[PDB]
Request: fold
Amino acid sequence: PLYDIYIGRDAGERARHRAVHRLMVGNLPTPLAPAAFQEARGQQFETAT
Amino acid sequence: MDVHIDNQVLSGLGTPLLVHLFVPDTVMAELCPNRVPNCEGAWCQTLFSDRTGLTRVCRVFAARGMLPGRPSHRGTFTNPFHVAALRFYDEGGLVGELQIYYLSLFEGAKRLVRGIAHIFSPHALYVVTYPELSILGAPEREFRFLISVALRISASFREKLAMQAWTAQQEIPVVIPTSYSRIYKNSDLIREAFFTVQTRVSWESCWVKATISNAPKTPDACLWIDSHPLYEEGASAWGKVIDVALGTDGHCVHLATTSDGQAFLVLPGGFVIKGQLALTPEERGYILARHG
Amino acid sequence: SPEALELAEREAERARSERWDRCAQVLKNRLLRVELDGIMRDHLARAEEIRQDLDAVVAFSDGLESMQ
Amino acid sequence: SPEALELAEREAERARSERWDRCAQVLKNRLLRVELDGIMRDHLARAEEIRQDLDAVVAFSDGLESMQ
Amino acid sequence: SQASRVLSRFVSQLRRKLERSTHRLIADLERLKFLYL
Amino acid sequence: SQASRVLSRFVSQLRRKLERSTHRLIADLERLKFLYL
Amino acid sequence: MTCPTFTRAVRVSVDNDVTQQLAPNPADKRTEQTVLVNGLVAFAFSERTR
Amino acid sequence: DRAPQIIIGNEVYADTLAAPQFIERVGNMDEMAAQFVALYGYRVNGDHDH
Amino acid sequence: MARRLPKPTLQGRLEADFPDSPLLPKFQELNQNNLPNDVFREAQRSYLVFLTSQFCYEEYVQRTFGVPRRQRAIDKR
Reply:
């Protein structure tokens, strides 16, 4: 969940995957957390602080 | 700074004078991309701005550490015109040569640690001074050396094509799609292949390692290959050993050197061209002093 | 074909030449910047010596009527 | 698939053919050289100015001693 | 009475022209690096 | 006899060192002209 | 009088946080962004106005 | 505290001691009424593509 | 310039035809010696822009300075 993985095309050597940190909450894909979840979470944050 | 007192007991063995140093991690990122290896193996060398050279002092085996300054990240701890060379490596095969020019080590020891400009790579290098105790030719030699050697190999390939009545055959049984009807412009294959062969230069190319063989028995049965992408789609890899797949995958120009002086140019589609390797005793000796 | 060969050869020549001219330009640029910084550090080191000796003039002037 | 293979290869061909042109210039080194001569002329002028003032300093030191 | 005048006014005259050359080098080298670097 | 000792010795010390900076500029600017160009 | 030159693009690249540093490649631990200098963001243009 | 880099065009930029190398200072219109001629001279003659 | 936006549509023969302005005597100094008619006219046009900018700024500066108290004290006599 914390890392977004991909493959690069190979050249001169078999390619090795690469991973980037998602760095934030909102970068989770919409299939795993739809937008309505984000609206509910924001409303909960506001009621929190 | 412990390796510095670790050296000086036996440091006088190899070389009369040395300079203590520290190398940032972003500076090492030139040598060892996609990795952060330790430098316990890392063995130095020395270099002079004339034909004379001495190497293999093996100065410092140094661990990583943060600098004494708090805002110093996490870097790797360790005639005013020459290209001093250093060679880092680990227990594995991850080896990298870095250049240093004087006017950075002499002037860099100014005043007990200070940043200096690195001419070869645009980043700072830190030098620590113990408080109690013909400009362009010097970097231009290796380049023209390797360029002329590769051009000699290219001329051999051209004459071997001339011997075959300007035709080619296969020596690696890979079935082509048989759809080659100037698709990929079968002439452009050899045009771009010669492009990449004559352009690219690296001290660790295939023929470099193939010239210097430990034994007579084993390297006869050993092949040294390097394949690089067509039209610079990526980075090159040098010095793979063969104790075929490379003829299959397209857009990879393959160069295979034997220990005997044979070179082989493999194109996408398994076609093989032969060439000969010839080095005078002087260039052989210079390469033996460098690589060995 | 025989004719593509010399084409590739001259293209390799031009590519190597342009690479070299550009690398020389960049290196000379960084080197001249480093030289300017060295010149400025030397010149401040010598203007500081001038200041120090002029202030020595001042100090031994302050004791002149004392050595009369 | 051969079609997409040749298409991607020709795309890289286009990219690394456009990457090919570079230029060179000479006059800038001459201009930067003449800049140094200008700076040298100016600094020598100011040096002789301040030197002549320092020389007249001595005459104005020995001269006011007749005013006492 | 004269020494307090001389060995102080001449000193100021020398130092306030000492500083000018440092200021000029500061200006001119930065002019060099901005104009052609 | 003491002013004659001061106001000439110090002036020599100042002139010979105002000569130093110009000597060094002469040296180093030509070093730039030859060594990096 | 002091109106600046052409607007430009400049790429800033920083390392990530110490809590997110862990990864085997040094290239990945950085994140980068592009700043427009002396330019301005803008809304959709009309056809006559473009 | 994380080591940042400013990639301006082609050139990298690391230290604030390189601040007089890569970054320009334009003061107030009041104070910058002295060098407007050189500003215009660079605006017209200058080579902005590099 | 490898590329630039096309020139904005403008009138022609501004500097000479309509006005005779205090800028013209300073403007006359620049010369065309090497440049062709087109590039010379374009650089001329840019220099006229620059002179206008200088003049506008210089007049605005004294517009900003304010009102003197003494001239208002003389309002009586």
Summary: The two ends of chain I are 63 Å apart (CA to CA). DSSP finds four helices and no strands in chain I. The interface with chain G takes residues 53-54, 57 of chain I (CB under 8 Å).
